[PDB]
Amino acid sequence: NITNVYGRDIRSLNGKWNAIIDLYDQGRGMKVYRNQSPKGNTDFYEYSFQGGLRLNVPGDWNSQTPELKYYEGTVWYARHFDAKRLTHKRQFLYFGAVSYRCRVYLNGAEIGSHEGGFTPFQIEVTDLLNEGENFIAIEVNNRRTKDAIPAMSFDWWNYGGITRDVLLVTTPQTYLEDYFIQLDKESPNRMIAKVALSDKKAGEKITVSIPELKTSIDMLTDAEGKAETVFNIKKLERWSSENPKLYEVIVSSANDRVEEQIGFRNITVKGTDIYLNGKPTFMCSISFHEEIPQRMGRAFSEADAAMLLNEAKALGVNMIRLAHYPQNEYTVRLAEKMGFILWQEIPVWQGIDFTNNNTRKKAQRMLSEMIKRDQNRCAVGYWGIANETQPSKARNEFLTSLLETGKQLDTTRLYVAAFDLVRFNREKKRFVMEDSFTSQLDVVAVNKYMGWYHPWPIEPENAVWEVIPDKPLIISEFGGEALYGQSGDENVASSWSEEYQARLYRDNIRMFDNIPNLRGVSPWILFDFRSPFRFHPTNQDGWNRKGLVSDQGIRKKAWYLMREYYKTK
Amino acid sequence: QNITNVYGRDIRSLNGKWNAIIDLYDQGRGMKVYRNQSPKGNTDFYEYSFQGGLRLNVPGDWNSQTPELKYYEGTVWYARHFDAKRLTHKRQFLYFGAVSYRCRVYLNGAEIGSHEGGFTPFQIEVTDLLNEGENFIAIEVNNRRTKDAIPAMSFDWWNYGGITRDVLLVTTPQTYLEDYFIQLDKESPNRMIAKVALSDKKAGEKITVSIPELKTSIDMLTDAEGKAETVFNIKKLERWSSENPKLYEVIVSSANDRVEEQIGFRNITVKGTDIYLNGKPTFMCSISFHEEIPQRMGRAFSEADAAMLLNEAKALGVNMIRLAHYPQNEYTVRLAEKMGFILWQEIPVWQGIDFTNNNTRKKAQRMLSEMIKRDQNRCAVGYWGIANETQPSKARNEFLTSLLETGKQLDTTRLYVAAFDLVRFNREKKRFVMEDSFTSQLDVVAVNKYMGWYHPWPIEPENAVWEVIPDKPLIISEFGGEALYGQSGDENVASSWSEEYQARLYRDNIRMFDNIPNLRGVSPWILFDFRSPFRFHPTNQDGWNRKGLVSDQGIRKKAWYLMREYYKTK
């Protein structure tokens, strides 16, 4: 899979695609991908890709027409386009994300497939493009199954469709495939530069430039085409939230050449303190889903990133948890430019089947797609392997096999997981937790909703945690629900009132001091978002109302409290 | 198990606007939303409510009520309050004409019943479970397609979910008339079977059947199983016929119970390759329609719906109605009886079904039994259908054979049929023939062929001769082709979706029908355009199988008049 796809020679295939809603999964059996028209006087075809529904690409389909809102199943996307077959350079179809599973058909024939709706994938078509007009037809499916990631239930909407850019990539016949150019784990001056080619020949040479620095390394490929060196770097200005430093890095070779803006930093841990570069940093975070609430559909563009991140800005955060799945690159790249530390996880959690090994491979596969795509993102200071799980036999293996997979790819960043297992034993009047697996981590994250799902069992001021005192602690989810505009009694949870929410936030803030290892907090969540089991007809109406901003973009009373808390660090 | 003639009992309707929650990821059951919990403390809260939100009409599909529900598959929760009086003396039941496709019924916070299969009724006794005054009922209605269901993952009609027919409160005395079967013995123009059964199993209770119009009253007594049975003879009896549809006031009575019903009487028989209605050989001028009202894109459920569907069939001139691929509601059926239509009712078994699944054989057997038992006193029915087209196989033929065994143990007065798409043209005999030995155990053999449409004409229509099961009566139960109403196109081009092509196609099949010696009925597929999720052509189909002789808007196509004229010569 080709890294830094946006530095390459790309033609976008976004726009209006013809579509067929295929509820009974009959289109394949009818070979709709051939796009047949009646030839004679006796033949006919009960479908067509002209003059009917057209869906916007990129996007979810659910927000595009009200009939599609709850649609699960197969939708056929199709499109004509123009290619030119090339003597010299090769060509690939590239997909940012297709939710959830798909089959790609170019000119009447299956050419590839993929599963997992948040990670990119590509198919080569150098020897497949007809010259001039081509016909591309994709069957996108989002049916929930017990063996998927995520599985049958999850607290967000099952958006289907081609949810990110469709790109035609052109590369020279022997191109730079992957590279990994980042600053060493614990040391601030030692630089790694792993690079790989497309062809596998020894003796080809690879060179890494940084012209702002006065640095330029050469290396020779091995038989597998890969090159790996480690070297010293000089007047190096490390990326931070304060100044988001990104240099212009250049990789070149025989006949390929990529430019990427890349930054460098050390993030590590000893004891219960998290060190960005030199200084120990407190993580003043926020999460949000990949979703623009005002149009009730997936976020997919540069403009969408501006809106989501420019609100995280005004709230004054230094970190961002990208919810529960890898989000798109416009968001990730724009957060790196602006200064947010990033945490990015795969949608693994208790609802996954830890029995099934095919799902363990899917998990390891998705983790790798995540780590690979964003391996050069100094903003990403965390990799998440799971949200709330419970300690079991298959669980501990499953997750350890995920750190196994991940660590074989990148040990610069940290491996966190979230837990919902803080409990209140009465005898000691404090909040404990006992889970053996927590040792294998770097940071530990707790999801707890004090004064929402968990009624305060003692005064906040006095409520103290003894949860895993050895490693640092991030509260990755807390908060509660409120409908913007709804007033009510600040002592009544079910009022769904900005008053009660703001008081839930007051009580929680006063609880944070009562634990010594908190090195960050993150409210769930920045914006109200769509979830299919938020059934309350007048309070929820399909929305998880825990956001600090309502589905209409307007800040709740709790938001201004969190602004003030973050201003003081 | 099931109370016959429900609309002759002490009934109150629970129809109306029920409160509704769409439950896409099926979380409602675990949250126990059927408990109807309201917050009462300062730390309480529930993420559901059955007040202030979506309300769905009952009865009806949900698909046509809101555009978000048009393609909705999954669970929808229906709920409402109702008042009831806990009657010291009597018994009270809940009765569902149909809930599609599967459901769990909860009353006052407690599960009390379930059902699978979306076209047949079922009931739950609630005598001991009702509060006095306000009661609350929640129903988990689900329509997810599964491999083991009937139908299964794919079928040529829309997957309408909901409480599609009446919800009834039935009051009966503590010992009530549970069931009765009163029809002419077959063949026999004036012998009357009368099987009757009480609810308690008690010996020697009196039971009376009267037909005051025929000055007949007949007394009997229960056997240990509370069942009674008598044959008797009857004179000056008019027999129900498609020509004049006579029906009789019939009264069943016990010590405490009594129920009235309009029942007619007839004999339908086969001899060789002919079908005999009340002695006279008769040719079945037939049509089908789905249980659907095309102008609103929803299921049909009322007396008014019945009239609209059935008066369009009367206007065509037909004497028979094939009720699609499933039993339809009691309104449509009893209005057809009143208006003199012969009825064919089948269960949605076809090739798609999983025949290697014993529970699926049992599910088919229970559906065919619910169908037969509900309509056993409807003299208008002369054909129990057991399957649409199915390919031979050991697993299939044991299956279908077990459908015949199940029916005959309930009913022998009506004909049994199944439909077959195994008609083939070999160039050798220059004929149309069919290789299937299951046909031996059918009374009538139905065939679905679409010449000039799915299967284009190899030989000229006037030269198309048929050698299909030539020792039995043969009915073409499906044929036709598609047309968008109003669209003019070239008479010769099938893909034109023109009315003019569909007329010519119907012209040609009229020819073919004269070359078919054992042919004793035809039946266009279909009366109205209907909804189907794999008819994708954006501009000619848009979700419609345009094979109707009438448009989705209810305008008659060119081909409709040809069939009216074919049907006047009969």
Place this chain on the structure above:
Amino acid sequence: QNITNVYGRDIRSLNGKWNAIIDLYDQGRGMKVYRNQSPKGNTDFYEYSFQGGLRLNVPGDWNSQTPELKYYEGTVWYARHFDAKRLTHKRQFLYFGAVSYRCRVYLNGAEIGSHEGGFTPFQIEVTDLLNEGENFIAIEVNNRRTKDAIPAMSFDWWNYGGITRDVLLVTTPQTYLEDYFIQLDKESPNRMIAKVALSDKKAGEKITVSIPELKTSIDMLTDAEGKAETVFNIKKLERWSSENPKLYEVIVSSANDRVEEQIGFRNITVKGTDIYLNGKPTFMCSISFHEEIPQRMGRAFSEADAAMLLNEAKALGVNMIRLAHYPQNEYTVRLAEKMGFILWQEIPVWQGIDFTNNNTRKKAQRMLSEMIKRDQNRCAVGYWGIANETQPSKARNEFLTSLLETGKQLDTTRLYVAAFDLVRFNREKKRFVMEDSFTSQLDVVAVNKYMGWYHPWPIEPENAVWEVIPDKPLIISEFGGEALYGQSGDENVASSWSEEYQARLYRDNIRMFDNIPNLRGVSPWILFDFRSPFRFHPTNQDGWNRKGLVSDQGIRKKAWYLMREYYKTKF
């Protein structure tokens, strides 16, 4: 003006899916979308097309076809292609059964006609205007409410716009029978009338009316105006009635033209406080319904629609149907005639419109003639109604009387009626009463009164005694109250919207009908729930006037049965 019996001519449907453009700002005419200009080359570009997007079904209202159109008021452009042969011998017309409310028609690039009023037909001859083969027709359809229209700014039903009835191309020979009127004379049970006209204002030409079943045939010839006419005796005549609705085959021949039609024959007469039908004094067990299919939220237009509406009325036990406040479509009327419903049909004038606008009087008159013209031969139409409830004044009395004159010139076989809501309880007399001199001019007086709904009971029902117009026959043309099917409530609480309250209402009103000496007809408002934009109650109404005996979903309410049992006691 309008060719009689369009459905018995040489006709050709133009129904089916047309392409549409929603013209919110009425910028369509300014850019001449009716020319269907496609771009020529690099310079040309056009901001409109008539293929590729939205298609509206014809016939129908646009409101029920897409939710974006439910409330839409403005111009919608309908257009389509169609083929045609130019026949020099024969002539050809476009016939619109109804376009609501107003429209301009645009053949092949230029306007060719217009019409105003959305419940009655019109037509345009096109003979010398058709191309050969491809013809293009665009229709600018508009439903903006106005102060000077009939109806005007407010009315108690949905403002359905669009091409709501059939659209036909009709062929007739160059000279044809443009019109005929053939009905028994008023009062007399065996003498028939037989008027005919022709396109050519030509003397001498001969017409031959004849009805095979009664072995009776008559010849006649035209005056200089083309209009023949005679009266004649006819024998063994079976007359049309509710119990036995005899229609007859009627053939009429000219030189080059011949038309058949089912027509029956009956006598409708008022003598005293009594309505007489074929001499028989008869009580009108009536009901009304709008031209609407509730489950679909749309106008009716087809035979299927008609059968659903009329089989629900037959089930209830009625001999009469009041077709609500406007003339309805020819399918409904004609099938009602075949089933045996006496029909009352009226125009939508009532207190709302501007009686001081002589121009609006002209519209009212042109609309009453169109209604009377189209359905001249419908022996089941027993009543023309000129107005729903209106209140006395100089301009009103003038406005109404002129309509009575307009009509009585065109027809005197049927009763004329109007509705009134002026019945007050006089506390002194303890009686229900009305004074209104204009009533004397009517054959029958209709009253709208909602005792126990709009007007709470001032006296116990069995003591409600009417002395309303003691000398004319009285018909209570509207009464009733609202209920939401399924909703339980206190039978004493009218805001409960409960079937229980609406049944009590109906029992109480039934009881009052025993106390009205000149009562010769009752007629519930209404059969089905129907749409109206000021029935606002969010959970009781939701845009439904809930006064139907049958819900918007087609299920009978508890009141439906009391009226059934009431009608069985009137036979």
